[PDB]
Design an enzyme around this catalytic site. Structure first.
Site, mmCIF file in Angstrom:
data_model
loop_
_atom_site.group_PDB
_atom_site.id
_atom_site.type_symbol
_atom_site.label_atom_id
_atom_site.label_comp_id
_atom_site.label_asym_id
_atom_site.label_seq_id
_atom_site.Cartn_x
_atom_site.Cartn_y
_atom_site.Cartn_z
ATOM 1 N N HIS A 67 0.442 -7.415 61.840
ATOM 2 C CA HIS A 67 -0.223 -8.911 61.658
ATOM 3 C C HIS A 67 0.525 -10.107 61.923
ATOM 4 C CE1 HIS A 67 -2.939 -6.005 59.805
ATOM 5 N NE2 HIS A 67 -4.317 -6.624 60.367
ATOM 6 N N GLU A 98 3.448 -6.746 54.740
ATOM 7 C CA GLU A 98 4.422 -6.812 55.857
ATOM 8 C C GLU A 98 5.593 -7.753 55.579
ATOM 9 O OE1 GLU A 98 1.805 -7.513 59.421
ATOM 10 O OE2 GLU A 98 0.482 -5.919 58.629
ATOM 11 N N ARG A 108 -12.787 -30.093 36.327
ATOM 12 C CA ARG A 108 -14.059 -29.644 36.582
ATOM 13 C C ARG A 108 -14.976 -30.001 35.023
ATOM 14 N NH1 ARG A 108 -15.491 -24.040 38.948
ATOM 15 N NH2 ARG A 108 -17.480 -24.826 38.715
ATOM 16 N N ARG A 140 -20.212 -22.175 41.074
ATOM 17 C CA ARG A 140 -20.485 -23.516 41.654
ATOM 18 C C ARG A 140 -22.063 -23.252 42.231
ATOM 19 N NH1 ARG A 140 -14.852 -23.551 43.804
ATOM 20 N NH2 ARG A 140 -14.208 -25.594 42.986
#
Ligand SMILES: [K+]
Ligand SMILES: [K+]
Ligand SMILES: [K+]
Lengths: 250, 250, 250, 250, 250, 250
Positions: C5, C77, C220, C165
Site C-alpha cells: 500500500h 508495512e 465535550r 454523537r
C-alpha cells in the site's frame, strides 16, 4: 426408512430436488393439493411429507415443525434424499406501521435470535437467502399483483419472550430481550418468525438454496384480531406465491 | 463546509441521492470520467469526492479509505448531505477454486469480521445488501456479458492477520484467526475485503440502500501475480457495472 | 514499491527506525517541516509519507488514515521497512470537566472499542503503551511547560455512535452504545479517538514500541466552538511535543 | 381454544397441575395408557395432548416436538393452563463407557447448547432440575430396580453437528463444535438430548418444577445398532418411571 | 509439604476422603471441635486445616478463603491428598422475602458470576451440586427440624458491586451489574455468596462430589442488623447440619 | 470495626493514604519491618494488616489473599478507610527466555484472565497501572541497581489450569486454556500472577492509584527448582523496591 426421523426413502421422492417447507404439518396437504398428482408419503413427529408434480416435475412438501432444531433435522434429512432447494412459506405478524394485513414479505436475510444457526456458522456469518430463490419469490408475488416488502426478518427461538410478548404466565421478559423489539423496529426489521435464521444459515453455509415468503395476518403496531376468511385468504395467497416461485426454480 | 470530514456543502451535491463508493481516492476520477460533466469537489484525508451526471441526474463518487471506521464517516456525512443509496466497487481476491480472475462478484451479505458494524447493530443482525441494489448490479453485470457469482463476502478489519496472510513482520496469526480462512471457504464464502460489513450493516439498519460489486484480480487458491493489463481491464469492467447499476437505481 | 500500500522502498527510509504517525495526511508535511532536510517520499490512499532528520538521524512521518484498519496496514508495512517505534499525535475532544482546551493528553492504555485490535490479541489483552515512549512524551510535554493529563483513552471504530454523537442522519444510538459515554466518564476515561486501540495492541503484542499524545481542542462537557488560531496553536504544541519525544527515543 | 398453539381450553385439564412431556407425539398415548381414564385431547402441529388420571387426580401428557423453541411454547401454554410441574421422558444415547444400554439417566442439570434458554436467563444461570422432581425420579427408578446414573446431560439445538455426527450431507462440523464431544465426556457429561436446557432453564427461572429421566438405547462409545425389542422395553421402563415419579409429586 | 500452598502431607490426612470447607479459617477449629479427636494440622495463607474423626473415620476441615481462586487451590490440593467429597458451609444473606433469618439454604446449582469456573468448563456448563451430597444435606437439615429452602444461589467474584451493594467508596455499580439483583430475584435465586460457582463447576467436571449449605443471618429484602447470639446460633445450626451430612456420606 | 472484613477502624490508620498489598499474610510483617514503628493491627481471614511509618508518614501493609475476589474486598475496605494508592508486590514465575531468576518485573497492564475485574469495567477497558506508580517502581528498581523488565503480565483466576499447569489431579486443561500460554508468550507477556487484573481495573476505573512489582523466582521456559536462599533474597529486594516506591509517592 433411509433417514432417522422423516420416515422416507430415496424412491419416495421420485427424483424431487425442490421442497416447499411450511412449519405446520396441516399445511402440507394444502400446498400439495395446488399441484398435480399429490400423494401423501409419511407423517412422523412434526414431519408430514407429501409429493406432487409441477410442470411435470416432482416436488416435495414437508413440514419442519416450529424452531431451528426440528428445522435442521428436516433440511438435513431432505438434503440426504436429494433436496437442494428449500422454500419456506408461513403467515406472520408485521412489526412496521407501513405494512398492511394481506401484504407479502420476502426475506432477504434474518437476525439470528436462535441457537441452531450457531451449530453451522459463527454469529458473524449472515443468515442470508439465495439470490435466485429471493428473485423467484418477488417475481411470483409481483406476477399475481401482491403488495410486497422485501427485507430483514428477526428469527427467534421463542414465540413469547424473544418476540417481547407480555401476556404470559410470568408477564415478564429477561433483561437482554426487554426493549429488543423497539431496537429491531428502528433497524427496519419487518416481522418475527421462528425457523429462518436456522434455515438460511444452514443452507447458505452448505451450498443449498433457500428462500422465505410470508403473508401478513396481523400488524403488531396497529393490532386487529383476524377472522378466519382473512387467515385463509392470506394463507392461500402466500401458498399461490410459493408454488409459482417453485415453478420458476425447477 | 457542512460536515466535519468530507469538506462538502449540501449545494455541492446539486440534489444527488446516489453515491458510488470505492475505497481508493485514485479510483474516484476513473469512475467520474464514465459519466457526464465530471467535477472534482474536494480532497481531504482519505475522502476524495467528485460529482458527475448520469441521464441528467447528479451522482456522487466519494472514496471511503480502507476499513469500517472511515467508511462509517463517509456514509454518515454523505447521508447528512442527501445520499440515500450507496454502491461500493472494488477489486478483490477470490478464495474459491471455481471463481476465475476477471470474474465479477456481487455480494448478497457479508461475514462481520469488523468492529464498526457493531456500532449500528448487534452481531446477530445480518450485514445484508439491499435487494434493488443487488438486482441492479446482477442485471448490470449481465448487460456487459460478465461472468458473475452472487454470494457471501468476508469483511475484515485487517488486510494481514484477518485474511490469514503470513508474509508479515511477525509471520504469525492470533489463535481466533488461525485456520478461519478454511472455515469460510467451507461455508462457501467468495472473497475477503475490508469495508462491506460496515457499509451494509449501517445502511440496512437505517433504511439507506447499499450494494457491492467487485472484479476478481487474484485467486488465492491458485495464486498468480496479476498482469498490469488484466487489473486495469477488470477494474474498468467493475467500474462500468457499478455505473450502469446506478443508472437503473436512479 | 517494496510494500502493497505505502508505495515505499527500504532505501526511501535511509535507515529510519522511528515514525511519527498522525491520522491526517495533511499533517505529515507540517511535522516533517519542524525537522531538518524534510523530503516528500510518497502519497497513496490515506498514506502520505515524508522523511526528515533529527539530531542527524533519519525519521519518518507517515499518516495512518482514520481507524484501526488503515492503521494496521501502515504499522505493518512500516514495520517491514524497519520502523520499530511509533508515536501517534492528534488533537481531540476531552470528556472530563477538569481538562481544559490547550492541555495535553498522554495515553497510558486504551478501551478497545474497535475491531482491528482483536485480529492481534483477544479482548482481555490490554491496549497498553510502551513505557519508554509514554515517559518520553510526558517528559517532553513537561519540558515546554504543558498542562498534561496522563491516563486512559477510549478508542472507537466510529466517530458518531461509538462516541455517542446524536446530531446525525438517524439521531439514534444502538442500545449497546447508548449511555456508554457516561460509563467511560465515571471510569476516568479522558477522551475518545479512533486509532490507538489498534496501534497500541498490535505494537505491544509484537515487540514494537508505541505511544500517543493529543492536544485538547474541545471539551465535550463544557463545549465551545474552537477558532482556527486555537486549532493551530493546539496542533503546533502537540507537534512540538511529539518531535521532542522522538528526540528522546532516537 | 384458550392458547395460540396447543388447541386446549382450561376446563379440558380438569384441574391438572402436572404434565409429562415427551418429545415424540407417538409416545403420548403410550404414557396416557399406563394411567386411568386416558382421553386424547388434541393434536395440532407437534403438540399431541392426552389427559389421564393417577390416584384420582388429573394428569396431562403433552408432546413438545424436538428442540427448545417448540418446548418453550408447550411449557408456556400448559403453564397458562395451570401446569406447575413438568417431567420430561426420553430415550437417549450415552456418551460414557460405564453406562449400559437399558440403564436409566436422571438429569441434575444440563449443558446449555441451545438458544431458547437464553430467552429466559443469561448463560451463567444453571439449567438445573427441581430437587423434588429429581428425588422422585431417582426413588421411582429404585422402585422398579432400574440401574440409575444421576448427573449432567448436554442439551443441543441440533441432532447432527451439535452432537458431533459426521454421517451427514456435508460430513463436516463447524470449528466451535468440532471436538466438543471429547470435552463434554472429560467433564463427565452422560448423554446428549435436545429439549432439557430449554425446559429446565425456563422452569427454574419462573418457579415451575421440572425434571428429566431417560432410558439408554445406544452407547456412542461402544455403538451397537439397537434391537427393536430392547428399545420398546427401555421406553416402557422410562415411561413407568416418569409416571411413578408423577405419583410421588402429586 | 506434599503440596504448593496448603502445607500438608498425605500422612497428615490419615486416610480422610471427605473435607468440610468453610471460607473463614476461624471456623475450622469450631467445626473440627464438634467431632472426635480434633487435631490442628497446618495454617498458611487463607488455608487453615484440622483433622478429626466421625463415627471412627478421619475427616478434614480446611478453609478456602474468599473467592473461586483460593477455592480452586484448596480443592485441587486436597484432591491430590485424597479428598473426594467437599461440603461447603457458610452463613449468608437471603434475597427472597419468604426466607427467614435462621432458615437453612441448600444449593442445587449456582449462577456463575465468577471467573475461576471458566478455567474448568465453558459458561454453558452448569455449576451443579452432587445429588448424593445435596440429599445428605437436606436429610440432615430436616433431621434437626430446620426450615430449609432448596434451590439456586448466585456466586459472585465480588462482595460489593456483583451483589449490588451501593454503600461503598464510589457508590456506583458498573452497567452490566446494575439492576442484576432484581433479575436474580425474579428468577427465584435464594442468596448470594462467593465460592460455589467455582467449587461446584470444578468438582462436577472432574468426578469429585460437592455440596453447599448455609444459615440465613440477614434478609436483604427486609434487612435487620443481627446480634452476636443470632450469628452464633445460626452458625452452630449450619455447622451441626454439615457435620450430620458428612456422617451420611462417609 | 468500621468495615465488614478487615477488622480495622479509620483511626487505626492514623491518616495513612498508601497501602502496600502482598497476597501472602506472612509477607505483611516482613514489609512492615523495613519501616519505622511497625505495629500489627489485625488478622482476620486472609487479611493481615500492619501499620508503619515512612519519613514520618503512616503507611499500611495489608495482605489480599490469593485472587481477585479477596483483593477486591481488601481494596474497597481500605479505600473506605482513606487509602488512595496501592502497591502490590509478589514473587513470580517468568514465561520469557531472556528474563532471569532475581530479575524484577514492573507491570504496565495485565491480561484479564479473572472474573472480578468485570465487576468494575467491561472486558474492553484496560487493566492499566497508574503512571506515577509505575514510574516510582522503575526508578525505585534503578535505585538499588536491579535488573528490571517493564511490560504486560497475565492475571489468572487459577493457579493450575489458567496458568497451564498439568501436574494436577486430572492432568488436563479445558479447551479455551489449552495452548493459551504459547499465545501469551508470543505476545510478549512476562509472567502470570493472580490479583493484578482485579487490582488495576478496579483502581483505574475509580481514580485510585495502583502499581505492581514482582521478583522472579522461577523461569518456566528453563525451569529450575528455586534455592531457599535466592527466594528470600529476591523477596527482600522486591520488598525494598515497593517501599522505596511508596516513599516517592507519598
Ligand atoms: K419442533
Ligand atoms: K481509513
Ligand atoms: K482468597
Amino acid at each position: 426408512s433411509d433417514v432417522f426421523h422423516l420416515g422416507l426413502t430415496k424412491n419416495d421422492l421420485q427424483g424431487a430436488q425442490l421442497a416447499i417447507v411450511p412449519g405446520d404439518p396441516e399445511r402440507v396437504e394444502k400446498i400439495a393439493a395446488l399441484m398435480d398428482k399429490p400423494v401423501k408419503l409419511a407423517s412422523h413427529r412434526e414431519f408430514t411429507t407429501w409429493r406432487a408434480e409441477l410442470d411435470g416435475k416432482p416436488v416435495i412438501v414437508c413440514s419442519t415443525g416450529i424452531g431451528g432444531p426440528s428445522t435442521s433435522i428436516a433440511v438435513e434429512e431432505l438434503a440426504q434424499l436429494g433436496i437442494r432447494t428449500f422454500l419456506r412459506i408461513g403467515t406472520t405478524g408485521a412489526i412496521q406501521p407501513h405494512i398492511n394485513v394481506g401484504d407479502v414479505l420476502v426475506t432477504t436475510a434474518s437476525v439470528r435470535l436462535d441457537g441452531a444457526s450457531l451449530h453451522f456458522a459463527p454469529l458473524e456469518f449472515p443468515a442470508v437467502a439465495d439470490f435466485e430463490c429471493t428473485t423467484a419469490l418477488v417475481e411470483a408475488a409481483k406476477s399475481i399483483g401482491a403488495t410486497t416488502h422485501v427485507g430483514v426478518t428477526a428469527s427467534s427461538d421463542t414465540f413469547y419472550p424473544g418476540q417481547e410478548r407480555y401476556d404470559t404466565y410470568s408477564g415478564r421478559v429477561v433483561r437482554h430481550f426487554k426493549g429488543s423489539m423497539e431496537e429491531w423496529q428502528a433497524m427496519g426489521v419487518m416481522n418475527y418468525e421462528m425457523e429462518s435464521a436456522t434455515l438460511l444459515t444452514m443452507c447458505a453455509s452448505q451450498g443449498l438454496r433457500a428462500g422465505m415468503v410470508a403473508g401478513v395476518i396481523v400488524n403488531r403496531t396497529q393490532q386487529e384480531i383476524p377472522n378466519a376468511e382473512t387467515m385463509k385468504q392470506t394463507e392461500s395467497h402466500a401458498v399461490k406465491i410459493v408454488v409459482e416461485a417453485a415453478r420458476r426454480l425447477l
